[PDB]
Structure formats: C-alpha cells, structure tokens
Amino acid sequence: SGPPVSELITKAVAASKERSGVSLAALKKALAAAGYDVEKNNSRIKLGLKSLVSKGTLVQTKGTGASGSFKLNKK
DNA sequence: CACGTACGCGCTGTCCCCCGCGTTTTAACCGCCAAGGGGATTACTCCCTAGTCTCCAGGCACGTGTCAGATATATACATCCTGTCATG
C-alpha cells in the first residue's frame, strides 16, 4: 500500500529544480532510484504526469503533456 | 587522454491515417464457340565466313629526355569561432 505516488512524484520533481526542467526520463530515473516501480505503473505515471500539469500545482515549462521540461508554480 | 558539445532516442502528446467491416457493382471468370496468324516446319538455294599460305605493316618494347605538375615558399581569403551590442 503506502502513500499514493503523487507525493513521490512531487518529491522527485522538487529534488533538483533545474532551470531547464526535468525530463520524463530523468524523473522516472529518480523514481526508480527512490524504488518506486516505473515499468508496469508507467500508465499510472503516464496519467499522473498530465493530471499534475492539469491541476496547476506544477506547470510545464517547454514540453507538452508529460514530455519535455517541468517547473514549480510561481507561488 | 581529456574537454566539450551534440546525439539518439524515450516517452508521451497530439494529429493523422489506414485497415475492418460491410455492401454494391461490375467486369473477371468461366465456359463456350468461330476464325485465322504466324510458329514452326520442310524445302531450297544462296550467303558467308573461317582458314591458310603468305606478305607486308604498325604497334608494342624499350630507351630516353624534357617540361607539367610536384614541391616549396610567401600571400590572401575563409570561416568559424569569438567578441560585442541592441532588444524582446
């Protein structure tokens, strides 16, 4: 069970906060380094990485959907 | 060996498109029949060319010898990275 993976993905994206945002590749490598499965739950991450762009907590920098770069909200 | 910039591509995102299904049409298929065109076969007679003795002729073997381009040296651009400034 454990906590839902939204908190895990927020820790993964808040770990670095590069000026050019994290790729989907680098964030799933961070989640795999954390230990969360990224191979069978990649549909769950696939929907989560656009749900988080949609709800406004995180904004997408340069890519589209779950592609490209990502950064935190202004406030 | 070592600094450095770019490369493959992973994964979604998002448009895009082409098979699945099904129907409708239509001429392909079938199958049936008429007819003749030349493929093929036989005949005939004619071209046509390899060979050969010989005879002569040019092209390679070989030597050489002399200037076109290799080599070398001094110049000019290329160009590409670097440096600098206006602007969204």
Describe it.
The termini are far apart. The protein has 75 residues and is mainly alpha-helical. The chain has one domain (1-75). A two-stranded antiparallel ribbon has the order 1-2. The chain is globular and about 30 Å long. The longest helix is centred in the middle third of the chain and has 14 residues, at 42-55. Helix 1 crosses helix 2 (24-34). It has helices spanning 5-14, 24-34, 42-55; strands at 58-60, 70-72. The structure holds one DNA strand of 88 nucleotides. It is classed as dna binding protein. The entry lists the keywords Chromatin, Nucleosomes, Linker Histone, DNA binding protein. Nucleosome stack of the 4x197 nucleosome array containing H1. The protein: Histone H1.4.
How would you summarize what this structure contains?
The chain has one domain (1-75).
Q: What number of structural domains do the residues give? A: 1
Strand content: 5-15%
Helix percentage range: 40-55%
Q: Could you give a short account of the major beta sheet? A: 2 strands, antiparallel
Distance between the termini: 31 Å
Spatial strand arrangement across the major sheet:
1-2
Order of SSEs: HHHEE
Q: In total, how many beta strands?
A: 2
Judged by helices, strands and strand pairing, the structural class is mainly alpha
> Which radius of gyration do the C-alpha atoms yield?
11 Å
Global morphology = globular
